[PDB]
Design a protein around this ligand. Sequence first.
Ligand SMILES: Cc1cc2nc3c(=O)[nH]c(=O)nc-3n(C[C@H](O)[C@H](O)[C@H](O)COP(=O)(O)OP(=O)(O)OC[C@H]3O[C@@H](n4cnc5c(N)ncnc54)[C@H](O)[C@@H]3O)c2cc1C
Ligand SMILES: Cc1cc2nc3c(=O)[nH]c(=O)nc-3n(C[C@H](O)[C@H](O)[C@H](O)COP(=O)(O)OP(=O)(O)OC[C@H]3O[C@@H](n4cnc5c(N)ncnc54)[C@H](O)[C@@H]3O)c2cc1C
Ligand SMILES: Cc1cc2nc3c(=O)[nH]c(=O)nc-3n(C[C@H](O)[C@H](O)[C@H](O)COP(=O)(O)OP(=O)(O)OC[C@H]3O[C@@H](n4cnc5c(N)ncnc54)[C@H](O)[C@@H]3O)c2cc1C
Ligand code: SF4
Ligand code: SF4
Ligand code: SF4
Ligand code: SF4
Ligand code: SF4
Ligand code: SF4
Ligand code: SF4
Ligand code: SF4
Ligand code: SF4
Ligand code: SF4
Ligand code: SF4
Ligand code: SF4
Ligand code: FES
Lengths: 296, 662, 84, 79, 411, 137
Amino acid sequence: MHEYAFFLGCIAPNRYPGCEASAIKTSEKVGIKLLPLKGASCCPAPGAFGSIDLNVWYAMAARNLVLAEEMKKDIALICNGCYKSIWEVNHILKHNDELRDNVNEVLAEIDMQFKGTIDVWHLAELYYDDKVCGVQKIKDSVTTPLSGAKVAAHYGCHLMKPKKERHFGDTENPMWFEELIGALGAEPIQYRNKMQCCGAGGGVRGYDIVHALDITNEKLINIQEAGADAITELCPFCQLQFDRGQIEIKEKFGDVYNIPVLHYNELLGLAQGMSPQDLALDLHAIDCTPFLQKVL
Amino acid sequence: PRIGVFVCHCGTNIAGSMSIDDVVNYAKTLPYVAVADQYQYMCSTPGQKKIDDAIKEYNLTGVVVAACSPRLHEPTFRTATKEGGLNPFRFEMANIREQNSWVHMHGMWDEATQKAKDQVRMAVAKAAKLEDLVPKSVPVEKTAMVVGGGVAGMQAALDLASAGIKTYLIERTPTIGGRMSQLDKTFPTLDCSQCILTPKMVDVGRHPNIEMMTYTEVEKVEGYIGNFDVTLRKKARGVLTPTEATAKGIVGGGCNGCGDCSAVCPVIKPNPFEMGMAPRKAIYIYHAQVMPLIYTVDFDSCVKCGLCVEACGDKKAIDLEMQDEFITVKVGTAVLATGYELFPIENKREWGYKQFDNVINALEFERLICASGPTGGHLVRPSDGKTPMKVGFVLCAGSRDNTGIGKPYCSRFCCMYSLKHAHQIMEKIPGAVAYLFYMDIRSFGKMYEEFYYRIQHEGAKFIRGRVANVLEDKETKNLHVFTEDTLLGRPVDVEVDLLVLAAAVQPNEGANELRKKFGVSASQDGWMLEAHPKLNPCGTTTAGVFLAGVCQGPKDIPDTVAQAEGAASAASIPIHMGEVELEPYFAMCIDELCAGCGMCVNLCPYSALSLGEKNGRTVMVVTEAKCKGCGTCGGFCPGGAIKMQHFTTPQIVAQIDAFFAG
Amino acid sequence: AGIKTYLIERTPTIGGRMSQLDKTFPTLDCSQCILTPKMVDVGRHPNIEMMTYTEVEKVEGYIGNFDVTLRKKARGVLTPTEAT
Amino acid sequence: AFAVHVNMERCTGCNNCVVACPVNALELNTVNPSSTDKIYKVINGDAVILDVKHELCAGCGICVDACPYDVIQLSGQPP
Amino acid sequence: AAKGDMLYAWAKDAEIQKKGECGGAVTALLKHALETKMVDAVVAIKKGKDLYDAVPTVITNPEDIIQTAGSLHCGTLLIPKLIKKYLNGAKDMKLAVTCKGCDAMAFYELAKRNQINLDNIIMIGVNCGGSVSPVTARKMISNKFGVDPDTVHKEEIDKGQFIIEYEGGHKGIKIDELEEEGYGRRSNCRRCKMKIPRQADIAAGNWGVIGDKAGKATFLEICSEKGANLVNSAQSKGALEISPADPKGIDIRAKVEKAMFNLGDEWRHRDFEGMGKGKDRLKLMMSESSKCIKCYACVEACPICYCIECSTKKPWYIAPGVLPTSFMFHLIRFAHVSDSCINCGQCEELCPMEIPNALFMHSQQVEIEKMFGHIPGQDMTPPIHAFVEEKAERARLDATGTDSIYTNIFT
Amino acid sequence: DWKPQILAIICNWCSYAGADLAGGARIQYPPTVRAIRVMCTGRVDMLFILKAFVEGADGVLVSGCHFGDCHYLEGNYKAAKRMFMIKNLLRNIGLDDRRFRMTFVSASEGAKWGMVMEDVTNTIKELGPSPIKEFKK
Ligand SMILES: Cc1cc2nc3c(=O)[nH]c(=O)nc-3n(C[C@H](O)[C@H](O)[C@H](O)COP(=O)(O)OP(=O)(O)OC[C@H]3O[C@@H](n4cnc5c(N)ncnc54)[C@H](O)[C@@H]3O)c2cc1C
Ligand SMILES: Cc1cc2nc3c(=O)[nH]c(=O)nc-3n(C[C@H](O)[C@H](O)[C@H](O)COP(=O)(O)OP(=O)(O)OC[C@H]3O[C@@H](n4cnc5c(N)ncnc54)[C@H](O)[C@@H]3O)c2cc1C
Ligand SMILES: Cc1cc2nc3c(=O)[nH]c(=O)nc-3n(C[C@H](O)[C@H](O)[C@H](O)COP(=O)(O)OP(=O)(O)OC[C@H]3O[C@@H](n4cnc5c(N)ncnc54)[C@H](O)[C@@H]3O)c2cc1C
Ligand code: SF4
Ligand code: SF4
Ligand code: SF4
Ligand code: SF4
Ligand code: SF4
Ligand code: SF4
Ligand code: SF4
Ligand code: SF4
Ligand code: SF4
Ligand code: SF4
Ligand code: SF4
Ligand code: SF4
Ligand code: FES
């Protein structure tokens, strides 16, 4: 049973707690142990806080990293934006000496040092790796087939891009996340421009809601045209956009889709037999009941 | 010994960094120095006259010139030393310009003067110990080899043969011609490529002075400028030419190219000439215009069914049990003309080359548009066989790219061939529109700008924007090309029926292996390197090897042919003379110091060293022709039994001692 | 290659435009430094009849024999050979 | 020489994959046993395949047909 | 009997078996080879005078090898360089040579450099626990043992102590105690670790012979097919008796060999740190080497020095007449020999000026060895500079993790 | 009163070309190193280096072609092995082994030649005068 510190940023615990609950339960069912991070905070959200000040972005991400450093554990994440912040600041401060120095003399005011000893992983990346739980182990753990459901994957942008800074391979047409959805028994479908941004990154969600919603609506149109019955995602930002933004699209525009948006951990819980009440699917703006009728 | 020291000013390039007067007075007070003197331009005719007059007047044993680099002006001053009654090799330079002045210009003058005095002292110390050498002259075999049967190889072979030298033309493939045989029409004159080349292919095939050896490779090369012992692998063609059949005893003949064999062969495989678009049997020719019309057998795919031999009948040209024969050929010079291949553009995933059906590259487009290709010359969509009406051309596909996937250089001809293809589609399909997504149209050659003007006049759309990514419509299989029109200032989404990628070119497959066999180095770009990038673009640093064609860097057919004839001329220079002088830097074994340990023998890359019998004692023997003067053996030998002719241990140690003299 | 050659130049010196160039793209070498070796070779070659400051008045003939008439413009100064 | 994979998560230790494998049954149940190596052995309650390098299986399907709650997947394609 | 067998061997002839230090098997094998005409001569050590004088001898009469029987512990000489100089390198005649570990290593060094013919030479190797200089042994016996040295009959290093047999009885003193007091084995013998010459054709010793044969049997290890043939021929013609060795004997032979390795390591340590570190080692080396009078005895005695004319004799390296000679003289030997020094000590012990040539050279050799991984004198592996390899050179440049040869090379 | 005496032995085909290119490009560096110019670095015997160091070179530099880019196919592998062994000898005779280094400079690296010159000068200046010059006496 591999053990990881569970970073747990802002949106999953405070808006979609079923995501974190299913994360812990399903990760324990497969051979992974997710340990609470002691006093972790907002990973300085890369858009809304990196746009303001890169130095304080570095300092806060480094503080989050040195918490798990003192814990002597590897970070595990469930958010693409949190992955950007944590993993990328870890990578930058493992190689840039003057930035290490600057962050360290900022952190020395709170009796705290960064040395760069741990690694950062996304939970879906762990589920895909073969040393850690693999696709076959996921298939083994699945107990409810979830058959006869068309499911559209949204990769997001901060997990895989830029490919010159990550290690997940092709960004033009990846299929790895489609294999994790196929392990659950749901057939993943392909839609036009599947690698498009959801529109919520960089603080655009806050600065220009209509612009962000138009970017989201382009995706929703493509997904409905494909014929999806739900949208899996690996990011609480993207889930919030696809969930709230459907309501804001219904009100600001006149478009109705009613497409449930679920984190992959929530689908994994559904596959492994967790209850909809135990997943808190009532906390989503868009009702999941048609999808539950199909897969149950 | 009596040494003369002549210090050049180089026209203030040296006098503006040091005190030439002080250097000269120090040279006068140096030991062994008979005369020290200075001049503004020692490389000029008054400078050589000054050297010669000094030699005659002062009875000089050796000459030291404190001037520019030896790599610049050894030949000049060696010839000046010869003219004057000395050996050319009683001369030594002291580089006090490119290693003293130009690097110690600013704010440091007496330091540069002291450095110059030190360099002059070391040069005088070496020259007081130099002694006479005579360059070795070696005979040159009157044959030549041309590796590559493309336009550059064929032109070089024809040029050498018509100059009268017997020539070998080695081609790995069963036919000569190269890429130009695959081209359909040629920019900017729009001539048919096969029509203009078939004449020259016939000349090569008929020339009595050319030994055309197709379907053959170069296993190994040893030797030097004089004699290159080149071993060739005659791959098992499986079919006998009439000459070989008569030699083996079949009077009725060999292969006449009737085609019955391929009419009955049941195996069907892709044709590499048609870039895989077209079928060909196990026994086959690339196209109907191949020069040796001899019908290779593909032994990796033949099932030995024996139908081909029954079809061939009394001609008995097919020998299904043939094996790779090896031949050793002695040649005087060699010309390398290996050409190029298209860079693998499936690595650029944003342009769905392998993943979308209707995305092709420019050689596949050229085969599709040729009238002798898999189609009847009709461009049709690979996805469904329908005629396109909008065609996009992605220029710079994998080129001028610093991301590590593509090539950082320009492929030279891809702007021109994309213009040609746009013209061809707009004239062959009525109402079809060509869109060129370009980033610097490069029509630099003769009539190229006029060709560009004419294409725009016929109505190709030029969108200045590098393509960002390509999406495939799920149903119509049409391709959505996304970029920005940089001049218009807006993003664009052009939906085309067919997308053509003007991919970069790279050195052919196996070219690095062949150039390592011949001893040629590579450029920064990965192409074969030339002797001097400006004034010697054909010859290489290894003597007797010359470059021709795209193998030295991408070029159009005109530039390729000019380069090929230049290489043929350079390869003919030593063959016509019949003599060639080697540089007397060889290793010479001092036998009554050699102990016969044999340990130096394995330190020679060229196998110039061996153990032999002289006066009962087993001593080492140098093949002075094979030695190249590196000095590895002579730097090894513990007993000092190997002497390096112009860089002897006493000379080098005298230089060290003079440096530490104060 | 061994053929006797005439080199006609209208100007009093060989070299051309590259003699006027200061440095050369794409390698940034000094033009005269790289060319002077070759100018010296031309000036010393026994098989080259270097005729500077000379023009071609008329040409008649064909592939076999070209009867080329040259105008040796009045240089005003004698080379050592011509002086002797 | 195929590859068998046992889903440890639902293996009950029933040992009917060990008893039914005809390569395991070679040692004690053959006249003059040829090879005495064994694919499965139930260590700590789950079936462990000692045949790590996929040299002894013969794709018989006696073990896949034997496990009561299907848990053994047989791969007929090269690993 | 076959290339790896470990045997007990003694001579059939009772007189040969008495005069052998152990069972006379080296003298029975040499006699058999000579008289059955495997070899045309035999190069062994005999006493020329008192047992402190060891004289090499080429023997062709099979009647003279009984005089060669017995081991002289004061024989500090080296045989293979004499075969190259005065026997034409054994290029035309077969020889059978009795040799210690240093003499086997020297054979292999000279055969690498093509100076002898190991196809012709047969090497009967003896175990060696150390040799004493004859004059130092005399002073040892006069002072520490309190005996007149001319009284001694035999003397041997057995069980790590120096047993002498004189008229009156026998005595014994620990060799470690003697070596602390300033006597004992030679310095290079204290540092030596080539205790059982497994590179020779036969290895004979008194280690591992236990029980009823503790002083009348030689432990033989057959180390090659040539030695197997010699032994089988001798046993069949009946000049030598063979019984398979005792497993307990083999075990304690291994243990004594291993303990000798550890002792050699300890002496290597204490000597090499005794030389100093940094500029102190340069002042030690330079001040010692300023004594050299250029007798060239070190060059003429070194097995690795095979050059017709030494570079130390070339006027552009060493000024011919300047007697307080340069440090270049010894730098030229460090450069040429230190990569393959077999620690024979001849350079140290033949120096009129008492310069620690062997100590300096071995101190450099041990870590040229742990750098390049080349053990001198074991087999036909070419010297490190006579065989350079592309892949290995890449490997050492990449291991430095650097773009040049400047640092991150040593710990 | 003291100026470092650094001696360089540079091959003709890459290090001499690189130094010439640096000069042509007008890259300045201090005037402390004087070069010898042999054909290949395979020519460099160990006794050359040791002779330099015993005459009193405060530093010695040997510059050649990159691995795989020797004009004579493999002559700098021999030089590299020789210089590794020279580094070992100088460390064990107690002279400071950082007085010696071997750099691989290509024909086009004039800037790198200038940087090598600067770094060699700096290192020898830190190290100080060689001890042989006073140990001789
Ligand atoms: C799509 C496209 C269109 C083009 N259109 C034009 C055009 O319209 N006009 C124009 O002027 N140029 C055009 N070019 C460029 C033109 O093709 C080249 O200038 C020309 O072909 C160079 O010929 P080459 O002989 O140097 O090389 P190649 O034609 O490639 O010939 C090399 C030959 O050597 C052989 N060979 C390779 N390696 C070995 C080996 N190891 N041993 C033996 N033989 C070997 C190959 O099989 C081949 O036969 C075009 C290029 C492309 C890609
Ligand atoms: C500003 C500039 C910079 C350049 N820089 C570079 C550079 O960095 N690198 C590079 O590679 N190229 C460069 N070039 C191009 C380069 O100059 C040419 O490629 C090259 O000079 C061509 O030489 P040529 O012998 O053909 O012509 P020219 O050099 O012009 O030589 C022609 C010669 O013929 C003589 N002549 C003319 N008419 C007659 C006649 N009727 N009878 C007798 N003699 C006659 C002329 O006097 C002259 O000596 C540059 C060009 C320019 C204009
Ligand atoms: C200096 C020395 C130290 C030794 N130390 C040990 C030890 O610690 N442990 C051990 O087990 N064995 C040691 N031996 C070897 C020991 O003597 C063997 O047990 C013995 O050689 C067995 O042979 P043998 O009695 O059967 O034949 P022997 O009749 O003894 O034959 C001995 C042979 O050795 C030759 N010989 C004598 N002196 C020398 C010499 N100085 N150099 C070379 N050859 C010589 C003789 O000529 C003869 O051919 C040592 C030998 C020597 C010479
Ligand atoms: S010889 Fe060199 S330094 Fe002297 S003038 Fe000519 S180019 Fe200048
Ligand atoms: S049938 Fe025979 S002669 Fe005719 S093409 Fe085939 S091989 Fe040549
Ligand atoms: S043997 Fe059969 S498969 Fe081969 S070429 Fe002849 S007909 Fe075709
Ligand atoms: S020739 Fe034109 S299309 Fe080809 S790489 Fe250069 S700029 Fe791009
Ligand atoms: S020249 Fe030197 S290395 Fe070569 S065989 Fe003679 S002694 Fe040996
Ligand atoms: S110098 Fe020596 S090693 Fe180099 S090519 Fe000549 S003989 Fe061979
Ligand atoms: S398939 Fe057959 S041989 Fe293979 S493990 Fe199962 S029962 Fe055994
Ligand atoms: S038969 Fe099935 S449940 Fe029983 S041990 Fe084997 S794999 Fe497990
Ligand atoms: S050096 Fe070693 S093998 Fe030679 S005598 Fe001394 S201890 Fe014995
Ligand atoms: S033996 Fe001693 S004194 Fe004689 S040359 Fe060698 S070091 Fe000098
Ligand atoms: S240097 Fe001295 S100790 Fe080393 S092998 Fe030579 S003689 Fe023996
Ligand atoms: S020191 Fe060197 S040169 Fe002198 S003999 Fe020994 S190996 Fe030969
Ligand atoms: S040519 Fe420079 S190192 Fe060999």
